[PDB]
Coordinates of C-alpha atoms and ligand atoms in Angstrom, one line a residue:
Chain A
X2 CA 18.8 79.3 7.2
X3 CA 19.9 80.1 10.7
X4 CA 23.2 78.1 12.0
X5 CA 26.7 78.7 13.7
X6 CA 28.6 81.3 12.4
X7 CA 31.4 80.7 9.8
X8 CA 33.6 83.1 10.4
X9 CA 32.2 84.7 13.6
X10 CA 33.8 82.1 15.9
X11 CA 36.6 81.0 17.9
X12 CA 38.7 78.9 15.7
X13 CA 39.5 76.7 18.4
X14 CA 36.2 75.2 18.3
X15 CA 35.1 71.9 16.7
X16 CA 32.0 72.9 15.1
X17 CA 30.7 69.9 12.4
X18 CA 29.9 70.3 9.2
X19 CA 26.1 70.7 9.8
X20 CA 27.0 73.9 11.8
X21 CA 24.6 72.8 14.5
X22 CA 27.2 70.8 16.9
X23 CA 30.2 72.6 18.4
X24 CA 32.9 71.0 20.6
X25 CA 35.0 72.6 23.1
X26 CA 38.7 73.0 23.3
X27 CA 41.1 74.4 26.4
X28 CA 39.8 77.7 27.5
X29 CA 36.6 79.1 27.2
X30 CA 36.0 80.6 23.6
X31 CA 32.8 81.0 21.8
X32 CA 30.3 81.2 18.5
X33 CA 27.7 82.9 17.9
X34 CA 25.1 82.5 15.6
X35 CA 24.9 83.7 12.0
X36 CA 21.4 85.7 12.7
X37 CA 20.7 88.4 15.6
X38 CA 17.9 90.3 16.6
X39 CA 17.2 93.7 17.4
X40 CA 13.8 93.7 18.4
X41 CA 11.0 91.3 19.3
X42 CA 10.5 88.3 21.3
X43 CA 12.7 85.4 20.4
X44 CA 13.5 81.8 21.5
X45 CA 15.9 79.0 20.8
X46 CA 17.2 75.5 22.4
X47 CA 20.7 74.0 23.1
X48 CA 21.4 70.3 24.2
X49 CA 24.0 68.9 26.0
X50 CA 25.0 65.9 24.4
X51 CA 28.2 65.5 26.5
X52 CA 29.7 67.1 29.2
X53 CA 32.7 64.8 30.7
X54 CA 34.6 65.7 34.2
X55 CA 36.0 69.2 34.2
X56 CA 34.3 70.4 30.9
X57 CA 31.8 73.7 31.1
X58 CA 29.7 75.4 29.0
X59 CA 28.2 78.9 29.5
X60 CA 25.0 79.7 27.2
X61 CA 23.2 82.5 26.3
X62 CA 23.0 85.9 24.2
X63 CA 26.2 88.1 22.9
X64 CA 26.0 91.4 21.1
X65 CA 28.7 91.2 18.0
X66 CA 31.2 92.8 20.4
X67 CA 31.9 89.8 22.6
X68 CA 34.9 88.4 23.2
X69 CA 35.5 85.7 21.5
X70 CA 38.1 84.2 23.1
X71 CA 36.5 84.8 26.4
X72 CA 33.2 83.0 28.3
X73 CA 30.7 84.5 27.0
X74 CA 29.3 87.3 29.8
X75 CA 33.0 88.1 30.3
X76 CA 32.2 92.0 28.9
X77 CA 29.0 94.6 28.5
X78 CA 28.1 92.9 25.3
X79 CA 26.6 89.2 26.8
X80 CA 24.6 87.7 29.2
X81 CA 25.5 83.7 29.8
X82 CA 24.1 80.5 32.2
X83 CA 27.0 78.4 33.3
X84 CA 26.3 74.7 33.5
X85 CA 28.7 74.5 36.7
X86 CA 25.8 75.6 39.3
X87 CA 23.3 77.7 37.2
X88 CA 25.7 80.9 37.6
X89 CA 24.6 83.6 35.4
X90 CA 27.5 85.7 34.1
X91 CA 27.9 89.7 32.9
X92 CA 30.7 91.6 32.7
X93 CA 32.2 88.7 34.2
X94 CA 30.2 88.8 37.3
X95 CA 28.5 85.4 38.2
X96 CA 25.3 85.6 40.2
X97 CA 22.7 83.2 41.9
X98 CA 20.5 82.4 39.3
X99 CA 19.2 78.7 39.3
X100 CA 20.4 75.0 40.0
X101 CA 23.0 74.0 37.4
X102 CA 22.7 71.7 34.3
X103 CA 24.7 69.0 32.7
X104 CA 24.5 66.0 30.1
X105 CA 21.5 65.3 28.7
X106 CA 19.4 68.6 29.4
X107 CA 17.9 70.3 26.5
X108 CA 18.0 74.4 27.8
X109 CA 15.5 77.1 26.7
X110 CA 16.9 80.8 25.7
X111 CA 14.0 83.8 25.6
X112 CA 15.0 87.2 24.7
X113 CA 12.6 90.4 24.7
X114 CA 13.2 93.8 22.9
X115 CA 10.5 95.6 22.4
X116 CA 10.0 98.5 20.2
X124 CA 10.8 96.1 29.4
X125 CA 13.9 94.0 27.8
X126 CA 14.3 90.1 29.0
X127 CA 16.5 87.5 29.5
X128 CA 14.7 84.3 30.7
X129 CA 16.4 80.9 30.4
X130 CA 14.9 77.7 30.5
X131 CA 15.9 73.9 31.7
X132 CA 13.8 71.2 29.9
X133 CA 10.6 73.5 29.5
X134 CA 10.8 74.8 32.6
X135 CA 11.4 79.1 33.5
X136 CA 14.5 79.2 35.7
X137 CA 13.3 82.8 36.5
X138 CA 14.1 86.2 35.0
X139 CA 18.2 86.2 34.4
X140 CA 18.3 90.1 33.1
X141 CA 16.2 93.2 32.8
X142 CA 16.6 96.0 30.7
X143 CA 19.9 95.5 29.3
X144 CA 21.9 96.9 26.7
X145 CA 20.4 98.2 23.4
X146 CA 21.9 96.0 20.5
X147 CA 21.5 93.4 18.7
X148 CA 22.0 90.2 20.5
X149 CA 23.1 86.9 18.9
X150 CA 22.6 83.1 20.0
X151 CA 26.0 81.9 21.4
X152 CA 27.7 79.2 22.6
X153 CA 31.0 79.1 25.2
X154 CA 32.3 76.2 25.8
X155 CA 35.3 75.5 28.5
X156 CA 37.2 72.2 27.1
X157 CA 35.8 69.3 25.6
X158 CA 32.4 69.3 25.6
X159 CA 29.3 69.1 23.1
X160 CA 26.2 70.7 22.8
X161 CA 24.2 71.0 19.8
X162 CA 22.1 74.3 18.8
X163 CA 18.0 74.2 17.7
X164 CA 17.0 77.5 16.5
X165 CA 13.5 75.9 15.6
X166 CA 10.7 76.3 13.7
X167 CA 9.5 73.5 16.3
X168 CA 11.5 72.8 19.8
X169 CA 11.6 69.9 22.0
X170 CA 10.5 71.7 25.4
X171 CA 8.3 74.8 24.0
X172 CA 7.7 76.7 26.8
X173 CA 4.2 77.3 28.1
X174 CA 2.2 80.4 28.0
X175 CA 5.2 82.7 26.2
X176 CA 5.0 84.2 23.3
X177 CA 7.9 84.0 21.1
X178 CA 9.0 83.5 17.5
X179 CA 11.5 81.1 16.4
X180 CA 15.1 82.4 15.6
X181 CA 14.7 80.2 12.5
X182 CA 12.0 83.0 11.3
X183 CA 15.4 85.0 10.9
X184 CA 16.7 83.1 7.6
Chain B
X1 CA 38.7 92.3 -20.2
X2 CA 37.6 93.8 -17.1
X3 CA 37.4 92.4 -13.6
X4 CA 33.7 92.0 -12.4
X5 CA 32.8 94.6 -10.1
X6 CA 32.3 92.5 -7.3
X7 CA 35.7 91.0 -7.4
X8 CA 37.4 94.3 -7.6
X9 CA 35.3 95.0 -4.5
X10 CA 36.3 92.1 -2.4
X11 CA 40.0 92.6 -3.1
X12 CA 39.1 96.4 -1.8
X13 CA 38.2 94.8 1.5
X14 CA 40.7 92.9 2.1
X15 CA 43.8 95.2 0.8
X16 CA 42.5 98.4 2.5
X17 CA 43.6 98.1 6.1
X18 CA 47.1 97.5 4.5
X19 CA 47.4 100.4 2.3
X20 CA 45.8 103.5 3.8
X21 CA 45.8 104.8 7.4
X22 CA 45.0 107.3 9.9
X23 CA 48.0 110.0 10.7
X24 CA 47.1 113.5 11.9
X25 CA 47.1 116.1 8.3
X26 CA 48.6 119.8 7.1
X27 CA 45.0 120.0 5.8
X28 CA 42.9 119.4 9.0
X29 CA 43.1 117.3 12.1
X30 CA 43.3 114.1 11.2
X31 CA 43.0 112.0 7.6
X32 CA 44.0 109.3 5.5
X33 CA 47.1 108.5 4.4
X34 CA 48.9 106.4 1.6
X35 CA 50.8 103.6 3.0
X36 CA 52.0 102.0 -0.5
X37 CA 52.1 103.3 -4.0
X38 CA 48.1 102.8 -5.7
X39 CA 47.8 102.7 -8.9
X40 CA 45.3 104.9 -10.8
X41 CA 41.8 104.1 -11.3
X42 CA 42.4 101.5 -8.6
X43 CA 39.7 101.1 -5.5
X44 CA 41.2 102.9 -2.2
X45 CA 38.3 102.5 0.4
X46 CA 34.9 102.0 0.9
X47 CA 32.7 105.1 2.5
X48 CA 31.5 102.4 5.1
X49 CA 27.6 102.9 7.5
X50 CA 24.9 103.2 7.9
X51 CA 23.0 102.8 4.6
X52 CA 19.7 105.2 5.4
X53 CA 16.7 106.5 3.3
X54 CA 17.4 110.1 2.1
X55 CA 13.8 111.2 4.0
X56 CA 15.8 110.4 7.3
X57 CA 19.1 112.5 6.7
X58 CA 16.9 115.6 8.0
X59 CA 16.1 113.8 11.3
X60 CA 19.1 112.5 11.8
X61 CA 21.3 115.6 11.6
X62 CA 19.1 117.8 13.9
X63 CA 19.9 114.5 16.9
X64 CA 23.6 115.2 15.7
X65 CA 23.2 118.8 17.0
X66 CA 21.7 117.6 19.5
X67 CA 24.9 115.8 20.4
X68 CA 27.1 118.5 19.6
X69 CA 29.1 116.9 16.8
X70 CA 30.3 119.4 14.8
X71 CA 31.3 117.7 11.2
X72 CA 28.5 115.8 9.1
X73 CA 29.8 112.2 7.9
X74 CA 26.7 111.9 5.5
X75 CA 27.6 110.8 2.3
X76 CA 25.0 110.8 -0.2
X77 CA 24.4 107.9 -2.8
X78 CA 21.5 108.9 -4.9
X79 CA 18.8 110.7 -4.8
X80 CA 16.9 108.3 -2.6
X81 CA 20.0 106.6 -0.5
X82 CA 22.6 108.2 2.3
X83 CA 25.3 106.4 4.1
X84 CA 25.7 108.0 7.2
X85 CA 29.2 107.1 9.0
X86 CA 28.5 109.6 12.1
X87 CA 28.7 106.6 14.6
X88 CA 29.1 103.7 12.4
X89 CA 31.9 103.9 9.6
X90 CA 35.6 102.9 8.7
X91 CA 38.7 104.9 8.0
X92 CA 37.0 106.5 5.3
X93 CA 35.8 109.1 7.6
X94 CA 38.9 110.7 8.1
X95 CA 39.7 111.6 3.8
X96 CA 39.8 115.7 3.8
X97 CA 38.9 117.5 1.1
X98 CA 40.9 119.1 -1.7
X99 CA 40.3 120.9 -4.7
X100 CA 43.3 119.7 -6.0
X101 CA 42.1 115.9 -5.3
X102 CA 44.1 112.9 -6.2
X103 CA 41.1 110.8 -5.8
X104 CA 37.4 111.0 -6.8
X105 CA 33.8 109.1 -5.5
X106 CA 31.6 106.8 -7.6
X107 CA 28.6 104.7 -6.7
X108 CA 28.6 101.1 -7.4
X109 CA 26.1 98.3 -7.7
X110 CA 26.9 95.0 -6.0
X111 CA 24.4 92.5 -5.8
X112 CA 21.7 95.1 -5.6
X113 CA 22.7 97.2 -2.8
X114 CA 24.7 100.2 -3.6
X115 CA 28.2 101.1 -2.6
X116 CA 30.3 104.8 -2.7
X117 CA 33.6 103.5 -3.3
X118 CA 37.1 105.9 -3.4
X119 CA 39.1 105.8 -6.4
X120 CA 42.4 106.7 -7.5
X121 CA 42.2 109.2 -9.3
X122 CA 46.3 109.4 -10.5
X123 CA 49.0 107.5 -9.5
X124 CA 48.9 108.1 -5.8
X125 CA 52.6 107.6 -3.8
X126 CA 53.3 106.3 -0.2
X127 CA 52.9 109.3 2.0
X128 CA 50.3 111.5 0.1
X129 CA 47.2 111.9 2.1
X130 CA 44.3 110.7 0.0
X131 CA 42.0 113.4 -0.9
X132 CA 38.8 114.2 -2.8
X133 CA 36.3 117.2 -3.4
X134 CA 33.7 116.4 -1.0
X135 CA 31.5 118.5 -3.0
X136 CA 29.1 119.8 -0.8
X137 CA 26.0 122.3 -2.2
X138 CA 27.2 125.7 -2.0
X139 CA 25.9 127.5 0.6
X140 CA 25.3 131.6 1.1
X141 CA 28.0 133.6 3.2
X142 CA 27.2 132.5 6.1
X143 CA 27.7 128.8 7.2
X144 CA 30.7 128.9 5.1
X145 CA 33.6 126.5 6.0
X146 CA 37.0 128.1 4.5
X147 CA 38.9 125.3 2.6
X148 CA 42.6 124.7 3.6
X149 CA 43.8 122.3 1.2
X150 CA 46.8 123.9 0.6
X151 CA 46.0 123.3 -3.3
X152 CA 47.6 125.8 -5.6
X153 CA 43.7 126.4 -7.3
X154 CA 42.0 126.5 -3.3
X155 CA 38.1 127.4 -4.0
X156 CA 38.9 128.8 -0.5
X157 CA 35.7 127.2 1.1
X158 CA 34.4 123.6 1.3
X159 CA 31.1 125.2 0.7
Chain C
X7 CA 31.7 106.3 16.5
X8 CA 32.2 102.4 16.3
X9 CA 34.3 100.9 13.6
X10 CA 33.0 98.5 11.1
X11 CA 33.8 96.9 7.9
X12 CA 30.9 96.3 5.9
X13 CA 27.7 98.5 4.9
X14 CA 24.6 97.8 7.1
X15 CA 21.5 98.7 5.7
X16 CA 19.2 100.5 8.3
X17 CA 15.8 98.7 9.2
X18 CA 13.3 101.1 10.2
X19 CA 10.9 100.4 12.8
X20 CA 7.4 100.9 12.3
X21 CA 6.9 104.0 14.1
X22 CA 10.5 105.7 12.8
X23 CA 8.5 108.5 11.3
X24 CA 5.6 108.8 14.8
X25 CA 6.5 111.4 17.1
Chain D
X1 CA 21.1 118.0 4.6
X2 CA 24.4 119.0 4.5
X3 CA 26.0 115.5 3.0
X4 CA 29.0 114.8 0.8
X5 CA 27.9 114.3 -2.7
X6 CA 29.1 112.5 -6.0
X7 CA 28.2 114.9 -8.2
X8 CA 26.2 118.1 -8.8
Ligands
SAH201 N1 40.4 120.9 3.2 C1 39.9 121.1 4.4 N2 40.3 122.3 5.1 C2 39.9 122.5 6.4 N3 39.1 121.6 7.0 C3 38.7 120.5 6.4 C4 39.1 120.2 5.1 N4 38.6 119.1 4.7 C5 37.8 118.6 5.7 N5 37.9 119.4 6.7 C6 37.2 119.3 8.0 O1 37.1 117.9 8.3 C7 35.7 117.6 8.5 C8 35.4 116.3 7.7 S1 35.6 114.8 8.7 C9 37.3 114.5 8.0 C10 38.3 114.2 9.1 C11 38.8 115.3 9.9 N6 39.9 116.0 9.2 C12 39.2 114.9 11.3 O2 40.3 115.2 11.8 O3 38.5 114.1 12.0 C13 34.9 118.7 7.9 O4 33.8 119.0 8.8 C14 35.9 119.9 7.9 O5 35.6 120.8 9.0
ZN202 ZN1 40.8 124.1 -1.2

């Protein structure tokens, strides 16, 4: 069964005891999950529950190598979607991307590897456009970085709450 | 009685990076070296990689010509099983051999994956570089790598 | 070479062996 | 083929 790492985390975080719900503290720091993938088409939701003034979260995939007491897309290893104006961040450049998100929204995260690579995030169902193409050869993790005291809570599946239409994908709960 | 296996092994991972580490060596470049007194029979390090079919070993070290690396960092299990520690490994990769060794390689079965695990094969002291006899399949004259150990008993080649 | 702690086990893909 | 070994 697929949940937030244990051990592979900022320790700074507030992560609950379902290991599904993870709480921000000071300066971006992260999590990743406890199952990557190397290959394939793969998909998995995050909800904001609560983002209060001056709290941040920046979402997305992280190879094991990322910082983990940096935003996640700070190094080589991860690409990240920043709440604060739908920024998309690697190697700790930030990019025009989309329209940001914030309380409430429940955001989509696509990865492709096949055997061409893609990073497509999503806002309530809907593609906010190709993020990445053709990035690094890894594996690549769900992950979570969270700047202060926010919450958001992690679905890997089997069923989500805004399956995207006409993309083919397998849940990253197939990985436990 | 004895400690099960898997215990023994845990304690390995979690006492290694304290007692062993990587100096340049008499014997060769670099290697391992002793960093507090280990008792005999006692678990140094793990060979830590890539765990990889032995059909794919073949494949895998014509690519590492290809790449120019000159020492192999395969490290055979059985007869169906090779960890290969070329680009993924730990400080393992670094023990030279002797044919005077003060430690020896032994496979192990945790949980029903397979581990090569250094042991001591004496009472090693602080300072000793750790050794063992890699023993690599003799080879004919040429591809021969001399052997400088500095044992007393020096087969004169690796190979 | 990158440094690592445990033993991974190496999946194959389906075509490892395809030239 | 050239890999350290256990044994012979
Ligand atoms: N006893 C010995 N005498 C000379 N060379 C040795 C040796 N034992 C190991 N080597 C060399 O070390 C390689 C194994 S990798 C071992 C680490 C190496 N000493 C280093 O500095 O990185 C072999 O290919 C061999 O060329
Ligand atoms: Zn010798």
């Amino acid at each position: 069964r697929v949940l937030l790492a244990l051990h592979d985390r900022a320790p700074q975080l507030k992560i609950s005891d379902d290991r599904l719900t993870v709480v921000g503290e000071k300066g971006y720091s992260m999590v990743r999950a406890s199952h990557g993938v190397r290959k394939g088409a793969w998909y998995f939701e995050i909800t904001v529950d609560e983002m209060p003034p001056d709290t941040a979260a920046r979402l997305g995939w992280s190879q094991p190598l990322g910082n983990l007491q940096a935003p996640l897309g700070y190094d080589k290893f991860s690409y990240s979607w920043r709440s604060k104006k739908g920024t998309k961040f690697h190697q700790s450049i930030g990019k025009h991307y989309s329209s940001g998100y914030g309380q409430g929204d429940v955001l989509g995260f696509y990865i492709n590897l096949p055997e061409s690579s893609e990073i497509i995030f999503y806002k309530n169902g809907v593609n906010q456009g190709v993020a990445y193409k053709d990035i690094f050869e890894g594996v690549y993790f769900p992950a979570i970085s969270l700047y202060k005291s926010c919450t958001v809570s992690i679905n890997f599946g089997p069923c989500f709450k805004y399956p995207p239409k006409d993309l083919t994908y397998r849940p990253m709960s197939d990985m436990g | 009685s004895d400690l099960p296996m898997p215990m023994r092994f845990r304690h390995l991972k979690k006492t290694s990076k304290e007692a062993v580490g990587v100096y340049r060596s008499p014997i060769h470049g670099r290697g391992l070296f002793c960093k507090r007194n280990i008792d005999a029979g006692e678990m140094v390090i793990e060979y830590a990689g890539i765990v990889i079919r032995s059909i794919l070993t073949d494949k895998r070290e014509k690519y590492y010509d290809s790449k120019g690396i000159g020492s192999s960092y395969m490290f055979r299990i059985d007869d169906s099983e090779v960890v290969d520690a070329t680009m993924h490994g730990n400080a393992a990769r670094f023990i030279n051999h002797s044919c005077e060794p003060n430690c020896y390689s032994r496979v192990i079965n945790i949980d029903g994956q397979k581990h090569i695990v250094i042991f001591a094969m004496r009472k090693i002291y602080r300072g000793e570089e750790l050794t063992y006899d890699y023993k690599f399949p003799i080879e004919d004259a040429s591809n021969k790598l001399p052997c400088n150990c500095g044992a007393k008993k020096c087969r004169k080649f690796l190979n | 070479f990158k440094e690592l702690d445990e033993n991974v086990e190496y999946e194959e893909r389906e075509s490892e062996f395809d030239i | 083929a050239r890999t350290k070994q256990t044994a012979r």
